[PDB]
Design a protein around this motif. Structure first.
Motif, PDB file in Angstrom:
ATOM      1  N   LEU B  60      23.553  27.548  82.342  1.00 37.80           N
ATOM      2  CA  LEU B  60      23.628  26.392  81.455  1.00 37.80           C
ATOM      3  C   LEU B  60      22.351  26.102  80.678  1.00 37.80           C
ATOM      4  CD1 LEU B  60      25.111  23.952  80.353  1.00 37.80           C
ATOM      5  CD2 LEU B  60      24.506  22.742  82.467  1.00 37.80           C
ATOM      6  N   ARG B  61      21.208  26.443  81.264  1.00 34.07           N
ATOM      7  CA  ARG B  61      19.929  26.180  80.620  1.00 34.07           C
ATOM      8  C   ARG B  61      19.270  27.380  79.955  1.00 34.07           C
ATOM      9  NH1 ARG B  61      19.753  20.498  80.991  1.00 34.07           N
ATOM     10  NH2 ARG B  61      18.008  19.964  79.587  1.00 34.07           N
ATOM     11  N   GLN B  62      19.338  28.528  80.611  1.00 33.75           N
ATOM     12  CA  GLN B  62      18.702  29.717  80.089  1.00 33.75           C
ATOM     13  C   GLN B  62      19.463  30.998  80.380  1.00 33.75           C
ATOM     14  OE1 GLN B  62      14.501  30.384  81.215  1.00 33.75           O
ATOM     15  NE2 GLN B  62      14.024  28.605  79.942  1.00 33.75           N
ATOM     16  N   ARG B  74      27.411  30.477  71.113  1.00 36.92           N
ATOM     17  CA  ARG B  74      26.792  29.593  72.086  1.00 36.92           C
ATOM     18  C   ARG B  74      27.646  28.418  72.512  1.00 36.92           C
ATOM     19  NH1 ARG B  74      20.763  28.471  70.546  1.00 36.92           N
ATOM     20  NH2 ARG B  74      20.664  28.016  72.797  1.00 36.92           N
ATOM     21  N   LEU B  77      29.532  29.545  75.243  1.00 42.00           N
ATOM     22  CA  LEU B  77      28.701  29.607  76.437  1.00 42.00           C
ATOM     23  C   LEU B  77      28.641  28.249  77.124  1.00 42.00           C
ATOM     24  CD1 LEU B  77      26.135  31.923  74.758  1.00 42.00           C
ATOM     25  CD2 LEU B  77      27.431  32.461  76.838  1.00 42.00           C
ATOM     26  N   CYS B  78      28.647  27.186  76.331  1.00 42.56           N
ATOM     27  CA  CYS B  78      28.633  25.848  76.893  1.00 42.56           C
ATOM     28  C   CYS B  78      29.956  25.593  77.605  1.00 42.56           C
ATOM     29  CB  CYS B  78      28.459  24.794  75.797  1.00 42.56           C
ATOM     30  SG  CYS B  78      26.810  24.653  75.111  1.00 42.56           S
ATOM     31  N   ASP B  99      21.869  16.520  76.289  1.00 38.67           N
ATOM     32  CA  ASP B  99      21.253  17.686  75.677  1.00 38.67           C
ATOM     33  C   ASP B  99      22.343  18.589  75.124  1.00 38.67           C
ATOM     34  OD1 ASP B  99      18.664  16.874  76.380  1.00 38.67           O
ATOM     35  OD2 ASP B  99      18.843  17.804  78.380  1.00 38.67           O
ATOM     36  N   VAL B 100      23.481  18.626  75.810  1.00 44.60           N
ATOM     37  CA  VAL B 100      24.624  19.426  75.366  1.00 44.60           C
ATOM     38  C   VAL B 100      25.155  18.821  74.053  1.00 44.60           C
ATOM     39  CG1 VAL B 100      26.969  20.134  75.901  1.00 44.60           C
ATOM     40  CG2 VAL B 100      25.270  20.111  77.708  1.00 44.60           C
ATOM     41  N   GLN B 102      23.512  17.033  71.989  1.00 48.39           N
ATOM     42  CA  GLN B 102      22.476  17.250  70.996  1.00 48.39           C
ATOM     43  C   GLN B 102      22.544  18.654  70.440  1.00 48.39           C
ATOM     44  OE1 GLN B 102      18.399  15.977  72.216  1.00 48.39           O
ATOM     45  NE2 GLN B 102      19.515  14.537  73.547  1.00 48.39           N
ATOM     46  N   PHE B 103      22.796  19.617  71.323  1.00 49.50           N
ATOM     47  CA  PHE B 103      22.871  21.011  70.917  1.00 49.50           C
ATOM     48  C   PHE B 103      24.060  21.267  70.018  1.00 49.50           C
ATOM     49  CE2 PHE B 103      24.291  25.444  71.470  1.00 49.50           C
ATOM     50  CZ  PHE B 103      23.187  26.055  70.893  1.00 49.50           C
ATOM     51  N   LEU B 106      23.739  20.351  66.396  1.00 54.78           N
ATOM     52  CA  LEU B 106      22.979  21.186  65.491  1.00 54.78           C
ATOM     53  C   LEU B 106      23.803  22.408  65.096  1.00 54.78           C
ATOM     54  CD1 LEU B 106      19.463  20.958  67.102  1.00 54.78           C
ATOM     55  CD2 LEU B 106      20.625  19.431  65.498  1.00 54.78           C
ATOM     56  N   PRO B 118      22.829  26.839  66.244  1.00 53.16           N
ATOM     57  CA  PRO B 118      22.123  26.071  65.209  1.00 53.16           C
ATOM     58  C   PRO B 118      21.962  26.799  63.874  1.00 53.16           C
ATOM     59  CG  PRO B 118      21.154  25.650  67.309  1.00 53.16           C
ATOM     60  CD  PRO B 118      22.072  26.816  67.509  1.00 53.16           C
TER      61      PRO B 118
END
Ligand SMILES: C[C@@]1(c2cccc3ccccc23)C(=O)N(CCCn2ccnc2)C(=O)N1Cc1cccc(C#N)c1
Ligand SMILES: CC(C)=CCC/C(C)=C/CC/C(C)=C/COP(=O)(O)OP(=O)(O)O
Ligand SMILES: [Zn+2]
Lengths: 314, 395
Positions: B60-62, B74, B77-78, B99-100, B102-103, B106, B118
């Motif tokens: 989830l983060r990297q 992506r 991926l989420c 953060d999700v 927010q992502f 973009l 993005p």
């Protein structure tokens, strides 16, 4: 300019002719999510693409930068789109492009964008002269490649190229008769040529199909074809078949024949046939042989079938 | 042996090549062999949650540079990860969630829809992923990111004269798009009277002699496209436009007698992700056939071997390091994790009005959270989401 795998390959920042342009970083936000740790060779090329794009520098050099971006990730439609923008604007040799995509589709056959690109090219040129030959080469390495078969069906229908597809199918069935993608291509050709209404054609097909089933009784694809070419017009409409199968019961009765049988009765209990009850029992009996001994994986299917054969018949 | 996969009689389901060899039988036999040993070995089944949780949590983060190929996917991926966190019933932190949001913001185009990441152009596939990832989050912050106007305006730019849509501007056509457009048009409450004009009828031309559905009219019946079309029809309520009986005979045929799992198309290999794409089709038919009044429908089970699928996912699809996979010998990935887990959930839970009967092989911890067969997100995530947007305009 220099290929991504070449020993003397140099990042884009360390390149002279790319000095006047500033690299645009990817905007992933304060605290990213699913942020890929891109390799240096990767992040470089794209940071520079995010540039020529963010400017819309429809330049010849950004055209070369596209090949590299596409190499690192052929699935990037944004990049591919910009490649067609430049392709037009810079009036590039569409004949040289075919050469490109041929190599890309060769190295990355299972990618969506590579194939769509090739189409757009054939369209532009209004020239399919190399198609069949090319798709057969990809198919030669993977006889079932979906993207291949789909592109092949397009060519044919678009440029009336039915003439040899059947013979092609026959050749491939020879190699592998279990190729369900070729049994699909078979139905495809015929359907758009002679159709299955012609009794001579439909005739030939059933024999051929049957011969394949005889030759390899457990190859489900053939059964499916036999069914597909007869089903909608009515299995009950062809009596001989019902018998010509229940005459191979001893020497062949795989769950595929038993199953086809039930298929036939169900169409009889539809158009209404003599001994409507003798049939029902012939069908239920079969549903349980399947749902209990020869097709246990499909028990919940056959249990329902039986239940429906009654419910609605009676 | 209480396991359908591990009894002696079950060992009779091995492929019968009738002594003839083709590249197909050989491969079928190679998977069966590897499946044999896996089965063998075992002679209770457990869902390596913790192990999976870490995998999911980290992801989830990297991601390693291994995911450079899914750079333009992506939002997928989420969704894949959030949904696997959903099924495994694992709460999402408000910072993670935000953060999700927010992502995914973009990635959202100024024209509507979303992009792979993005700054990328809007595409129906990733747009579906985001609108789906946003609803899994479930907050107001999530929902409010969708420029409900822009979306509808974007779907309209892709719609073709034949009822079919494009995947993105200047892109190809296939049943996947209609599903993406339908799923996002429905959740966000933005379906205008002529939006899916002649769509149901197009999806219909995609069903073929096989009984299933191909990408485009003429193509071979595939399990991923079939789900795409039937589910789209369930949304548009045109399930009736297809020969559901042939669709049912087909999808049910796709489950492997030996392996236990599903293949994507007749005479090909078993895959864990098809545990959803194919098996998920049954709940859908079951629904349409119920809306027709079918009296022969089972009241506790799905028209497929629920125990066998589970046994295939539990014995053959889990990775030690965590995550689930295609088949033994394949490297773990988040997509197969999402659909392997989604499959399992469907294999365990049965619905049909008041009738609810759950099957849960192995231990009780293996039980997962249900998932809505049409969107593959929590049944509640759906009710909650459509509700919110229904309390919204439309035009
Ligand atoms: C690459 C892709 C795929 C890409 C983008 C969006 C998709 C949306 C839905 C289904 C597949 C999608 C795609 O085109 N196919 C289809 C072709 C290969 N395939 C068919 C059945 N199992 C694998 C995927 O299966 N994907 C998923 C995939 C494969 C390997 C690793 C990961 C991960 N993590 C994900
Ligand atoms: C909503 C959405 C975008 C859904 C996608 C569903 C899905 C699973 C699609 C796959 C299409 C495809 C190109 C298959 C060929 O796979 P293959 O040749 O790699 O493998 P196989 O032979 O086992 O199918
Ligand atoms: Zn898969």
């Amino acid at each position: 300019f220099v290929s991504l795998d070449s020993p003397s390959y140099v990042l884009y920042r360390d390149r002279a002719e790319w000095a006047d342009i500033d690299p645009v970083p990817q905007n992933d936000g304060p605290n990213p999510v699913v942020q890929i740790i891109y390799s240096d060779k990767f992040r470089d090329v794209y940071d520079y693409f995010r540039a020529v794009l963010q400017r819309d520098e429809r330049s010849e050099r950004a055209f070369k930068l596209t090949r590299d971006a596409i190499e690192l990730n052929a699935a990037n439609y944004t990049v591919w789109h910009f490649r067609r923008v430049l392709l037009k604007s810079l009036q590039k040799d569409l004949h040289e492009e075919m050469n490109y995509i041929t190599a890309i589709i060769e190295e990355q056959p299972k990618n969506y964008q590579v194939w769509h690109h090739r189409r757009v090219l054939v369209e532009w040129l209004r020239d399919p002269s190399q198609e069949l030959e090319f798709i057969a080469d990809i198919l030669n390495q993977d006889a079932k490649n979906y993207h291949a078969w789909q592109h092949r069906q397009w060519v044919i229908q678009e440029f009336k190229l039915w003439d040899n597809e059947l013979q092609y199918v026959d050749q491939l069935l020879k190699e592998d008769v279990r190729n369900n993608s070729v049994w699909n291509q078979r139905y495809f050709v015929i359907s758009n040529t002679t159709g299955y209404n012609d009794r001579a054609v439909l005739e030939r097909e059933v024999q051929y199909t049957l011969e394949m089933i005889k030759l390899v009784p457990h190859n489900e694809s053939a059964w499916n074809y036999l069914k597909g070419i007869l089903q909608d017009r009515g299995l009950s409409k062809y009596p001989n078949l019902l018998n010509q199968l229940l005459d191979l019961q001893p020497s062949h009765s795989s769950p595929y024949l038993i199953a086809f049988l039930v298929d036939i009765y169900e169409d009889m209990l539809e158009n209404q046939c003599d001994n409507k009850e003798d049939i029902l029992n012939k069908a239920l009996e079969l549903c349980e042989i399947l749902a209990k001994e020869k097709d246990t994986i499909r028990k919940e299917y056959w249990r329902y079938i039986g239940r429906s054969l009654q419910s609605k018949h009676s | 042996e209480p396991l359908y996969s591990l009894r002696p009689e079950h060992a009779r389901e091995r492929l019968q090549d009738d002594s003839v060899e083709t590249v197909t039988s050989i491969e079928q036999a190679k998977v069966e062999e590897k499946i044999q040993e896996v089965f063998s070995s075992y002679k209770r089944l457990v869902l390596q949650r913790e192990k999976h949780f870490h995998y999911l949590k980290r992801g989830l983060r990297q991601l390693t540079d291994a995911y450079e190929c899914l750079d333009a996917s992506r939002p997928w991926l989420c969704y894949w990860i959030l949904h696997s966190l959903e099924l495994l019933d694992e709460p999402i932190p408000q910072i993670v969630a935000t953060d999700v949001c927010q992502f995914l913001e973009l990635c959202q185009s100024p024209e509507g829809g979303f992009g792979g990441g993005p700054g990328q152009y809007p595409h129906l596939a990733p747009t579906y992923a985001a609108v789906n990832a946003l609803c899994i989050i479930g907050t107001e912050e999530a929902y409010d990111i969708i420029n409900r106007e822009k979306l509808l305006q974007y779907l309209y730019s892709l719609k073709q004269p034949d009822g079919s849509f494009l995947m993105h501007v200047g892109g190809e056509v296939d049943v996947r798009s209609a599903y993406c457009a339908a799923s996002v048009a429905s959740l966000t409450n933005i379906i205008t009277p002529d939006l899916f004009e002649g769509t149901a009828e197009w999806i219909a031309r995609c069903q073929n002699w096989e009984g299933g559905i191909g990408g485009v009219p003429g193509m071979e019946a595939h399990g991923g496209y079939t789900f795409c079309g039937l589910a789209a029809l369930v949304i548009l309520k045109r399930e009736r436009s297809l020969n559901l009986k042939s669709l049912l005979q087909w999808v049910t045929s796709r489950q492997m007698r030996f392996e236990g799992g599903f293949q994507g198309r007749c005479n090909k290999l078993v895959d864990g992700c098809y545990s959803f794409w194919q098996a998920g089709l049954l709940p859908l038919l079951h629904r349409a056939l119920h809306a027709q009044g079918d009296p022969a429908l089972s009241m506790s089970h799905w028209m497929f071997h629920q125990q066998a699928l589970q046994e295939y996912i539990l014995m053959c699809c889990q990775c030690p390091a965590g995550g689930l996979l295609d088949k033994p010998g394949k490297s773990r990935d988040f997509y197969h994790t999402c659909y392997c887990l989604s499959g399992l959930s469907i294999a365990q839970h049965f619905g049909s009005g008041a009738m609810l009967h759950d099957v849960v092989l192995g231990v009780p911890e293996n039980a997962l959270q249900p998932t809505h067969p049409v969107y593959n997100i929590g049944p509640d995530k759906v009710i909650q989401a459509t509700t919110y947007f229904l309390q919204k305009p439309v035009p």
